[PDB]
Design a protein around this ligand. Structure first.
Ligand code: CUA
Ligand code: CUA
Ligand code: CA
Ligand code: CL
Ligand code: CL
Ligand code: NA
Ligand code: NA
Ligand code: ZN
Ligand code: ZN
Ligand code: ZN
Lengths: 572, 588
């Protein structure tokens, strides 16, 4: 019987972390499960006024040249794994708008690395290698473009127009390799060995899921059998068909129809491709892929071992670890629970009903996610279905509507809907982790790589950031270094010339957890947060003569209103 | 009382939350405490394009160059002392602005940078006869002019000002120079009086200086006297601003016609009008008290019928350590946050008044522990004469261990408290991001929203005007207008297709894309993202939205609809083709 408690009362704690995509708003959100309350927002592709992400020197360093963009469009959050289990080190997420992948460090809950994927447009599908650990982040570029894209050729049917499958080194956040494919890439997942990955493709009665022999790709890179594109040193391999001949790197498995979701069962047996236009899912037996690539099978369709008929508009699939799959039906507006091995037997002709239950959801579900579903520890406790049209499920709030993320108890034989959670800007997908899988820092380490370049800059100025309160003058450049301890800035006044470029570096030397300080320069567009033992810095030009106040934004003390300072700007 | 809202049940109240240091406004359902919408205001929102679109940057004016805000005080317009659901207003302390949100479309529709001031903090609205004025405090003392020759806060031309904004036009109405500084503010239930707390009567810049005086004050404004002087032309102007400026400073101990200074301890903070209209209540902060100013004694005070400004104080209850803010249940009780003691204290106002007259009576009814260090608190409808005494939200600054650990930056703790009975009851801990200062609640039936835009909505009326000069009918046209190195693309959109699915420009062209969502079904929103150009916006049904960007990269560049709108949403795409600069006339 499904009967878990969903109420988390005052003083009680949630059981799981939920990491929500921020959708078209560009951030990552940390929720508590089952309360579904948002505990934290992690800025990634958005500019965050509160913490200064996008404004501070540390954040703009991480974003690189892409710091010039104020937008992102993220969909697919995933947590790094060791031996097919979450290891709590990193979260990765895509940006479809400006073609990026970001890495979030789960000990500090901040984006610490970001890469613009070269020579592609629109990073959409994204998932992680599971075994032996997350060595690679796999990322789909959705849209076919010319190569080179220099304006001579616009023809998408040209022999050099294509998109590519992308592998990023998870630990260094540099590109590992790219594989040219036929068609457009949609979603992707990986197996439980490290040898294989797979992606649904459209555009090309039948499209396909393309399967990658990552071992074969790696071997070619080690031997130097690759090309490069443009000014990127990324190894590029050709996984397209040539005159009907297969690459060593890819096999194309025909699947109906404009397939969408591409999900690996937690027992490692199947890549399950959701049918979308076809009221089916297609089940690819991962154990038959070695024979496929070895040329031992008569037809790529022979790796298909199941094609259950589920209902109208299957989009995504998740797993309870008990042998059931759960699939969103976008048109029927349902989650369907079905037994995978019974579907496999049905495909062989046995009369057996693999469908267990259909639960109405509200309305038009897209992604769905069961707790630990991407790991061999899938625990079958909670399911979230992320529905696009909330209609009358919440109070009206004008022409824009919230997404409806519905929490469903799957611990028993029958799915039970227990909570409707409204969300902003269409998160699309989420991922859950056990409380004990996530370990966070209470206070920053003074050696943290997040602000190590700022420590380096201070070193060149002869500054001990833990103690110093000093103003360095360097032509028209002014570098203010200060400590802060509630309720006082360590430098409470400084004077500059109009036009000077001012950098303010603040080190919070409070040692009590949770005592954040802020720094805002009034009417200059300057804002940032500094947590205990963090160093943060921000650069702006003092283009206005006169007295200009700065203040601590984050309530830190009974005397917070009075934690202020003055920048005095002498006229030109 | 219904505390938990099940699937298919609806919340009973709207909550409008300050976005804190993040710069937006949030719409919550109460009592579920779930977030139903984010309304971008001072922040740049990737999802809707606020801060990127031409419509939003036009509303922000020159301040569109700032990517940050710091907002604290959301309040809803009123008619005869009750919410009328028309507008919400909120401050920006970071870049000295006031913004207006239209509650029918749930969008910021007007914004103003307040002239000749720094840091708009306290903000509240006239209640009676209606919200004609938005009252806003500028917190920091600055030189006038602030041209860099004088930096001294003690100079006779160094001061801050109280600001009144015309709520309907969102232009400045007047400003009143005050002594000291300004913290929080509220208005009475007659229209004559407003009041503000001051913590820097010392006009200092160091912590010790700002704490020296035993008493600062709440400054009371005679708005009738201010309006009379404006109509008589008895005012000045500062800089290039035409705003009437009135001098509310004391001159050698002589009061101005516009202000009275009521001594109040000490660095007081909250300034709250009781729902029965009897009191301005100032929270003592460094003093363990609140001071109760009797509004019905203010006409006598301005008429010289009182010898001491302290004579308008009729209560000063001792409550606890660090009183910051007070709210009201409409049953005669006040509720005050104690920041240091970390509690909400319930007390009877009329019994506190009798205690001030010497009658020993225990006006304190209950102290409820909160978690931890509460700042603002708000009871449902507390700002109106309909204060209903049902829900109370206390907004605490340090959540410590009340939620799962999330790293060095913690959420804040907004705690929902049942006050419908004699005993305050803590029912829900709500984590929030970026420290919302205050919130405001309204009954479900006090808010009326549109599901479909009107084609003449002023929000995009300037875009309609621009289209007309190109001979465009936005409801039907799919056209590419060329004008030198500018390209103006106009298209309708109807799921799952953009009306213009490709267009060609020259490298360096300045491209404006204007999209009119001609779907007429509720909640079919479209998006528009140009890949790798930093371009993103939303277009809701019957809205026109536009965005301008430079086509700085040659080659083919995809654009796509970001908001899921249709089963074939992934087909709602298009292509911009950019011919290379070397194939066109060369400039430098
Ligand atoms: Cu430091 Cu508030
Ligand atoms: Cu229009 Cu999705
Ligand atoms: Ca003082
Ligand atoms: Cl998927
Ligand atoms: Cl207040
Ligand atoms: Na990088
Ligand atoms: Na304006
Ligand atoms: Zn997706
Ligand atoms: Zn999907
Ligand atoms: Zn306050």
């Amino acid at each position: 019987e499904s009967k878990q408690k969903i109420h988390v009362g005052p003083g009680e704690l949630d059981d799981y972390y939920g990491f929500w995509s921020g959708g078209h708003q560009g951030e990552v959100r940390v929720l508590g499960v089952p309360s579904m309350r948002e505990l934290m927002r992690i800025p990634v592709f958005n500019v965050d006024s509160a913490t200064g992400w996008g404004l501070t020197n540390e954040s703009r360093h991480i974003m690189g040249d892409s710091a010039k963009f104020l937008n992102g469009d993220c969909h697919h959050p995933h947590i790094s794994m060791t031996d097919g289990k979450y290891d709590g080190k990193y979260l990765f997420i895509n940006d479809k708008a400006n073609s990026r992948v970001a890495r979030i460090r789960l000990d500090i809950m901040k984006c610490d690395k970001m890469i613009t994927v070269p020579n592609v447009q629109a990073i959409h599908g994204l998932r992680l290698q599971k075994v032996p650990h997350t060595k690679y982040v796999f990322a789909n570029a959705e849209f076919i473009i010319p190569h080179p894209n220099d304006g001579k050729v616009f023809d998408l049917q040209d022999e050099n127009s294509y998109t590519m499958y992308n592998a990023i080194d998870a630990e260094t956040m540099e590109m590992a390799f790219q594989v040219i494919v036929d068609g457009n890439l949609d979603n992707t997942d990986a197996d439980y060995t490290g040898r294989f990955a797979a992606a649904t493709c459209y555009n090309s009665e039948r499209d396909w899921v393309v399967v990658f022999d990552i071992h074969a790709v790696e071997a070619a890179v080690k031997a130097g059998d690759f090309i490069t594109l443009g000014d990127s040193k990324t190894p590029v391999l050709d996984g397209r068909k040539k005159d009907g001949k297969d690459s060593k790197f890819t096999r194309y498995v025909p699947v109906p129809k404009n397939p969408h979701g591409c999900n690996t069962s937690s027992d490692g047996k199947y890549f399950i491709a959701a049918g979308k236009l076809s009221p089916t899912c297609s089940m690819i037996a991962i154990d038959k892929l070695p024979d496929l690539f070895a040329g031992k099978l008569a037809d790529p369709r022979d790796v298909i071992v199941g094609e259950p008929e589920l209902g109208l508009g299957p989009l995504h699939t998740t797993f309870d670890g008990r042998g059931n799959a759960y699939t969103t039906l976008f048109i029927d507006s349902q989650v369907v629970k079905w037994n995978m091995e019974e579907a496999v037997r049905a495909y062989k002709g046995e009369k057996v009903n693999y469908i267990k239950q259909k639960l109405d959801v509200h309305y038009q579900p897209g992604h769905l996610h069961a707790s630990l579903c991407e790991t061999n520890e899938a625990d079958g406790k909670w399911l979230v279905a992320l529905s696009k049209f909330s209609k009358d499920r919440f109070l009206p709030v004008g022409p824009l509507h919230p997404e409806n993320d519905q929490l469903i108890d799957i611990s028993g034989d029958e799915m039970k809907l227990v909570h409707d959670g409204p969300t902003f800007a269409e998160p699309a997908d989420c991922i859950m982790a056990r409380r004990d899988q996530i370990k966070t820092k209470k206070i920053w380490d003074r050696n943290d790589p997040f602000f190590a370049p700022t420590v380096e800059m201070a070193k060149k100025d002869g500054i001990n950031l833990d103690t110093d309160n000093k103003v360095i003058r360097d032509g028209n450049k002014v570098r203010v270094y200060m400590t802060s301890m509630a309720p006082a800035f360590g430098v409470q006044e400084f004077t500059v010339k109009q036009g000077d470029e001012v950098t303010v570096t603040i080190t919070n030397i409070d040692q009590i957890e949770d005592v954040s300080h802020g720094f805002v320069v009034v009417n200059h567009g300057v804002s940032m947060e500094i947590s205990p033992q963090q160093t943060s810095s921000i650069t702006f030009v003092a283009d206005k003569p006169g007295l200009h106040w700065y203040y601590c934004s984050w309530f830190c003390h009974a005397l917070h209103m009075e934690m202020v300072g003055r920048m005095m700007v002498e006229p030109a």
